[PDB]
């Protein structure tokens, strides 16, 4: 299995970007395996 990289663009902000998505506030915990889980 060969893993390889290919350039896809510059890192730049775009003034005319599509805008979407909400802004949830979530209580979470991060375990030793790097997994986030919800907390109540």
């Amino acid at each position: 299995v060969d893993m390889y990289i290919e350039r896809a663009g510059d890192i730049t902000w775009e003034k005319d970007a599509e805008v979407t998505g909400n802004s949830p506030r979530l209580d979470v915990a991060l375990d030793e395996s790097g997994d986030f889980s919800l907390v109540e």
């Binding site: 350039r7 890192i11 949830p24 991060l30 030793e32």
Partner: protein, 149 residues
């Protein structure tokens, strides 16, 4: 070695398993994308240098270089590089992951798994973290995952 955002590909055919950022001669991606495997770039080889499973991050060729952070108030842009699609910018106001160790910005954006490692940018164009480690609320929400420089 050029600065930029890159697809991470694997080989019958090829498949995109993730994305990463080249900055200052160092390649940055998420641990779960490569598991630290060596990467080919043209005729050269990139070897892992630093990584951490709990942060879900890995750097190649040198130490982690990205250090900007979300300001907690402003919209940001996910520079998504989905499989088979041109790099594109998606602007959003992050929500927040509240943890016992402090708050982390989070983006409620759900792109294909091969987009993991795509950079999240502030208005100045600095990378404030990478996309692809998160939680489900049925929508996925990604932490804005940043390392330490």
């Amino acid at each position: 070695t050029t600065d930029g955002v890159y697809r991470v590909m694997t080989r019958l055919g090829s498949t995109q398993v993730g994305v990463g950022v080249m900055q200052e001669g160092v390649f940055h991606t998420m641990w779960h994308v490569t598991k630290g495997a060596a990467l080919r770039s043209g005729e050269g080889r990139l070897d892992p240098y630093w990584g951490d499973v709990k942060q879900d991050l890995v750097s190649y060729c040198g130490p982690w270089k990205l250090d900007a952070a979300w300001d907690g108030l402003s919209e940001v842009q996910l520079l998504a590089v989905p499989p088979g699609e041109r790099a594109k910018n998606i602007q959003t106001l992050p929500g927040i992951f509240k943890t016992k160790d402090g708050d982390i910005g989070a983006v409620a954006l759900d792109y294909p798994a091969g987009t993991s490692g795509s950079p999240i940018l502030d208005k100045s164009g600095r990378v404030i973290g990478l996309y692809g480690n998160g939680v489900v609320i049925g929508s996925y929400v990604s932490a804005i995952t940043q390392g330490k420089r």
